[PDB]
């Protein structure tokens, strides 16, 4: 609190000085730039010809040509002349063409995919590491399997042969499978692409094998990388029609995965991380190793583990030092992560009704008896069963 504060105040102030110093450089201070670069720009823009019509640079031919596809609608076989070199152009990028007669002027700009924008979500877990404790042994494993062959090459090189190519995170929700993928990805800072399994089965047919191959192929280009496939139970569970359920849809998606991961087309040291809450839906071929390598199983929380699982939920909320953990272990046990989330939410819910804007032991206790009953009730009790 007070110990932190002097340094915090200083960091914000160091950053202020940094902002203010930029303004003086762009406006007044020049030495190599001068009036001279201003004129270089004018002279280059007029020769270059504004508007510049966008193209995409697929590949460069060394003889003073390039093969461009103009983005207007009809492609052109241009020359590489005027303010760029063959090597200065880079593949899969957006380039400037002279509008009057198309020769490729150059690459200032890069082209991002339309696909990647939607898929992508930023890397960082909202529950900090070493506070996703509780099955603490398990948390370590993912750091070893996906993160490590990319972070540290030393062990792998001495070990020899093929590295890992995935992990599968499975078992009851609430043991934090999403938080783990995000941690390793954060650390490496490998582009984290994220798609829910339900996107694999949508109304249009063959979208599933299509999305998954494009997603991977994009991961290889933007490599090293982490692909997260969140909650692949949907394949069978969902259908918009007869064609969208059933064997053709289920097979095509599974079949694509098999070729993509270790098969002919392969992948680099790009890892796929799969979250699944049921491996009942998943086959023995995607639970096969060497395209999954170590599988991580989370079991139901143990009596001692349950106290550590409860702490994580309590940390996101307000920090308890007045909750009796024994009462929770005594009342229910060998119930999911999801049950510990259920006790927490219900306490917050009763406090909300009063307009009490805290949770205390009292809110946890009052809600706790109804929640245990409620767990059993969630699955049918019928008339009187």
């Amino acid at each position: 609190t007070q110990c932190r504060l002097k340094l915090l105040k200083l960091e914000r102030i160091k950053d202020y000085l940094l902002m203010e110093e930029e303004f003086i450089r762009n406006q007044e201070q020049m030495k190599p730039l001068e009036e001279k670069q201003e004129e270089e720009r004018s002279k280059v823009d007029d020769l270059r010809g504004t508007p510049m019509s966008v193209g995409t640079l697929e590949e460069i031919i060394d003889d003073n040509h390039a093969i461009v596809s103009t983005s207007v609608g009809s492609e052109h076989y241009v020359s590489i002349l005027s303010f760029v070199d063959k090597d200065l152009l880079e593949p899969g990028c957006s380039v400037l063409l002279n509008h009057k007669v198309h020769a490729v002027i150059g690459v200032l700009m890069d082209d991002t995919d339309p696909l990647v924008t939607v898929m992508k979500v930023e890397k960082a877990p909202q529950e900090t590491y070493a506070d996703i404790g509780g099955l603490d042994n398990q948390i370590q494993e993912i750091k070893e399997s996906v993160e490590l062959p990319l972070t540290h090459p030393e062990y792998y090189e001495e070990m020899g042969i093929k590295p890992p190519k995935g992990v599968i995170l499975y078992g009851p929700p609430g043991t934090g499978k999403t938080l783990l993928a995000k941690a390793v990805a954060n650390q490496t800072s490998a582009t984290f692409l994220r798609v829910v399994g339900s996107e694999l089965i949508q109304k249009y047919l063959g979208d599933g094998p299509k999305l998954v191959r494009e997603l991977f192929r994009v991961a290889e280009e933007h490599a090293p990388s982490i692909v997260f496939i969140d909650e692949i139970d949907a394949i069978g569970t969902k259908r918009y029609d007869s064609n969208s359920g059933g064997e053709r849809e289920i097979q095509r998606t599974m079949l694509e995965l098999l070729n993509q991961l270790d098969g002919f087309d392969s992948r680099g040291d790009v890892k796929v991380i799969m979250a699944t809450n049921r491996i009942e839906t998943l086959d023995p071929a995607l639970i096969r190793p060497g395209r999954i390598d170590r599988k991580i199983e989370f079991p139901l929380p143990d009596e001692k583990t349950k106290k550590r699982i409860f702490q994580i939920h309590t940390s996101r909320m307000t920090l308890a030092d007045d909750v009796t953990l024994d009462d929770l272990i005594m009342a229910k046990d060998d119930l999911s992560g999801a049950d510990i989330k259920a006790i927490c939410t219900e306490a917050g819910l009763m406090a909300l009704r009063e307009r009490r804007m805290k949770v205390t032991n009292e809110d946890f206790k009052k809600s706790k008896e109804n929640v245990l009953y409620k767990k059993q009730e969630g699955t049918p009790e019928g008339l009187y069963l």
Partner: protein, 396 residues
């Protein structure tokens, strides 16, 4: 940690905001990307603007029609999707303008300036073929009989068609690959491709079937034609249960999609002209789950056996996997191989690798015999169980 997380959250927020302004503002600051060697090229570039032959428009020649009255007529499809008929190149050979060949034609005059390298006629077929690596026999377990037939059938007629003439048969049009999965079939397939110096083109059956059927038909035909241009090639169709599944068509299911794509492939197998020395290799679980209709046995030739490793058989794969790897061991390859039940090759291969991951856990950096012993017990249980559907009731 509730009070501690807010402090940190605010401090980042402020520093992050300020950054937005600095980045935008600095930019590249009115510089030129080309630098000094392109200055001479600017002067050229201007001459070209005056010129009518620049810019060229890429197109493709769709069809050859003669009613010649100047110099040979060709109909090309422009990428604004207007058809135009153009004529023989200004100085280049007529033998460079062909059907399914790419050509550069003038934007302002529309006559063939220069022909270009061929193929861009399908959009989809170009997408369906993917990257090619090579892995060698060392890396793929076993020197067994099952391994040996793959080479003899694929490598020998394509490498030397001479041998196949001597016997008095043609080099296979078709070749069949069968064996249950998790045996390293794809791995073995990559390994023969390097030796033969026969290009392998990998293909996925899941791309072929699509919502409206017909795309997969044109794709398959175009795909055979491309391969036909290549000499001593293999079209390897991986993971197919479209061109690979059961023969049956429901008539309101995704089964329609399968049946069009299979049906063109039958036409291709025979060919418009035969396919002596061209191999298509197809992977199926076993030949009894493959069509009796797409399988018209004379053309397909040999069926190459691969089978699920035996207890002896897995003893053999495990020495290759271990030897390739860098490992320090005291315990032997046979013991651990007998330790495994009959299941798949894949569990037994993972042991060799898992012993290396236990070494990092153990706080070594290379494996030891105890890591090895630990790996068999966990691995046999893990991969085999906790998988597969819990129903085989009410399916077709």
């Amino acid at each position: 940690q509730s009070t501690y997380s807010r402090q940190i959250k605010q401090v980042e927020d402020d520093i992050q905001q300020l950054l937005k302004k600095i980045n935008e503002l600095t930019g590249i600051k009115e510089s030129d990307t080309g630098l000094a060697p392109p200055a001479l090229w600017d002067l050229a570039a201007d001459k070209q603007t005056l010129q009518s032959e620049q810019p060229l428009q890429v197109a493709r020649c769709t069809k050859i029609i003669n009613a010649d009255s100047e110099d040979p007529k060709y109909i090309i499809n422009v990428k604004q999707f207007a058809k135009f008929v153009v004529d023989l190149s200004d100085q280049v050979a007529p033998t460079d303008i062909e059907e399914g060949m790419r050509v550069g034609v003038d934007r302002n005059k529309y006559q063939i300036h220069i022909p270009l390298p061929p193929k861009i006629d399908p959009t989809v077929t170009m997408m369906q073929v993917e990257e090619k690596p090579d892995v060698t026999y060392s890396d793929v377990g076993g020197c067994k009989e099952q391994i040996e037939k793959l080479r003899e059938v694929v490598e020998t007629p394509l490498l030397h068609p001479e041998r196949f003439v001597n016997l008095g048969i043609e080099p296979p049009k078709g070749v069949l690959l069968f064996g249950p999965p998790g045996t390293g079939k794809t791995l073995c397939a990559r390994a023969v491709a390097n030796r033969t110096d026969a290009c392998f083109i990998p293909v996925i059956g899941s791309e072929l079937v699509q919502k409206y059927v017909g795309e997969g038909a044109r794709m398959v035909r175009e795909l055979f034609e491309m391969a036909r241009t290549k000499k001593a090639c293999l079209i390897f169709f991986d993971e197919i249960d479209a061109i690979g599944g059961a023969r049956f068509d429901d008539g309101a299911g995704g089964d329609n999609e399968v049946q069009r794509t299979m049906l063109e492939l039958i036409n291709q197998l025979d060919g418009f002209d035969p396919r002596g020395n061209i191999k298509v290799l197809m992977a199926t679980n076993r030949p009894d789950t493959l069509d009796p209709a797409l399988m018209r046995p004379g053309r397909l030739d040999r069926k190459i056996e691969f089978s699920l490793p035996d207890l002896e058989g897995r003893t053999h794969i495990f020495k290759i996997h271990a030897r390739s790897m860098s490992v320090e061991r005291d315990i032997r390859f046979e013991l651990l191989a007998r330790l495994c039940p009959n299941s798949t090759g894949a569990e037994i291969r993972s042991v060799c690798t898992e012993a290396g991951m236990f070494a990092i856990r153990a706080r070594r950096k290379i494996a030891t015999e105890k890591d090895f012993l630990e790996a068999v017990n966990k691995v046999i249980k893990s991969y085999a169980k906790f998988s597969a559907t819990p129903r085989y009731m009410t399916y077709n």
